[PDB]
Amino acid sequence: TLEKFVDALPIPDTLKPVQQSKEKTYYEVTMEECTHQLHRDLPPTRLWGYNGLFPGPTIEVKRNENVYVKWMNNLPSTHFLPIDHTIHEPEVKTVVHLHGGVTPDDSDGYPEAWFSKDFEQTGPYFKREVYHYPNQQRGAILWYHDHAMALTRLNVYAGLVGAYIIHDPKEKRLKLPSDEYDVPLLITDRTINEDGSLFYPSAPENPSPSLPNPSIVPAFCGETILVNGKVWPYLEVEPRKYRFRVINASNTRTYNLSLDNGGDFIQIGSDGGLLPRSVKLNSFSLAPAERYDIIIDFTAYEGESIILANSAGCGGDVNPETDANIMQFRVTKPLAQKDESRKPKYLASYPSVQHERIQNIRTLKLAGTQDEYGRPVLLLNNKRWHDPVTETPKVGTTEIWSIINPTRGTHPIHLHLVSFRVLDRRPFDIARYQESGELSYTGPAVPPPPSEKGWKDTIQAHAGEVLRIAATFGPYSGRYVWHCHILEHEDYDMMRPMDITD
Ligand SMILES: [Cu+2]
Ligand SMILES: [Cu+2]
Ligand SMILES: [Cu+2]
Ligand SMILES: [Cu+2]
């Protein structure tokens, strides 16, 4: 395998606006095929990148900043990863979704709002070339990536991901580590061929001869871990507090992160922004699309090399020599200035402070069937993507969604537009539910841990539990989506439209 901790962690440059005034900020980002070296010992890898970069440039905005991004497809007319046409026009379709964005529906990146190179062809829900992000939302770690119908797992794996940070000036007084000491960590697993080329499976292991070729697979587990586009990198840090914006940008893989010197993380934020109170953690789980906003305090570890370690398997136990490792910190950089940053306990209002009447309670079930080829097709509430819309909350109202998971695994459930509160999780009798559809609980409800007492938008629903969340649908109305954020599930076919009605 590739030798760990030999390349420095790249820090994506912050995107500069094409125009900027007090009233408006305007950016242009072009998707390009490009080559980048992912490890000291590899030939350059052919990739798809926003502005030809992997990851894409980091975009930083202020709360309420009036932002426009023209996202353009200048990709080749053919893909380089294996497309399975049996699961679902130009071959190469793209659309950018700002995940976590409180975004008008026609700038949200609907899967059928795709566009081919230079907008020559566009999907039936396409309305505009230049996306509008008003950013009228809490400070938080967002991220952007491709969301094209039936191609999301491939377009994202190709390299189309980047970070987007909203800064709320009202949080400045907290004096959290900032600027040079505030660093995104975009984690993506990949499998890389000897010649440096990306590998993505064209079929499951030992494909029945029934199977089409290529065939979609139900899960992707990469052999190698990359952070900010480099395989198992090191980062030289100063002996002081750092803030890290940790984003799982992987297709399937869930991570369970720790520090190998037994140091703590201080979680200050979740998907939807600052937690009410900081939380000291020795480890945390991070499923696809989740974000953790954390402080690591290197003050007491000068000289040390500390591995950000992973204990979660993907298709099997972790390998100590490979996917057990994420990156390495080296506490050897001289202090540029006194550490004047803080790690405050009191961060933000509780989500509970705000009282809301429950307009509706939906029960949703994670299910599926099997296709003519024998493959599993994963479905939300046994509906196809193309079935008439059933999730139709009213704008301005709050709902509890009760998500029933009788499957064998966790699924990270994501709703666009909104962030939400986690109410509780409760175990149930799976066999009974499958035979009769009757829900019998085998234990009391478990309220969220402190890490999930703030605002979330992507949430782990574990096997044999009912998960309840509370969301206020707004402030915009229109057509959005909800889906599993395991991309191999999302594309076949674990995604549904969501109408927020006025
Ligand atoms: Cu997403
Ligand atoms: Cu999203
Ligand atoms: Cu799933
Ligand atoms: Cu989505």
UniProtKB/Swiss-Prot annotation:
Residue sites binding Cu cation 3 per the record: H147, H416, H483
Required cofactor(s): Cu(2+)
Positions that bind Cu cation 4: H411, C484, H489, M494
MF annotations from Gene Ontology: copper ion binding; oxidoreductase activity
Pfam families in the record: Cu-oxidase, Cu-oxidase_2, Cu-oxidase_3
Any single Gene Ontology cellular-component annotation: outer membrane-bounded periplasmic space
Protein keywords: Copper, Metal-binding, Oxidoreductase, Repeat, Sporulation
Resulting phenotype, E490T: 165-fold decrease in catalytic efficiency with ABTS as substrate. 400-fold decrease in catalytic efficiency with 2,6-DMP as substrate
Catalytic activity, as annotated: 4 hydroquinone + O2 = 4 benzosemiquinone + 2 H2O; 2 (4Z,15Z)-bilirubin IXalpha + O2 = 2 biliverdin IXalpha + 2 H2O
Disruption phenotype: Disruption of the gene does not prevent spore formation, but mutant is blocked in the appearance of the brown pigment characteristic of colonies of wild-type sporulating cells.
Biotech use: When expressed on the surface of E.coli cells, CotA was shown to possess improved enzymatic properties, including higher thermal stability and stronger inhibitor tolerance. It has high enzymatic activity against three industrial dye types: an anthraquinone dye, Acid Blue 62, a triphenylmethane dye, Malachite Green, and an azo dye, Methyl Orange. It may help decrease the costs and simplify wastewater treatment, and therefore, surface-displayed CotA shows a great potential for industrial-scale dye decolorization. CotA is also a promising candidate for the clinical determination of direct bilirubin and total bilirubin, which are significant diagnostic marker of liver function and cancer.
Oligomeric form and interacting partners: Monomer.
Protein name: Laccase
Annotated organism of origin: Bacillus subtilis (strain 168)
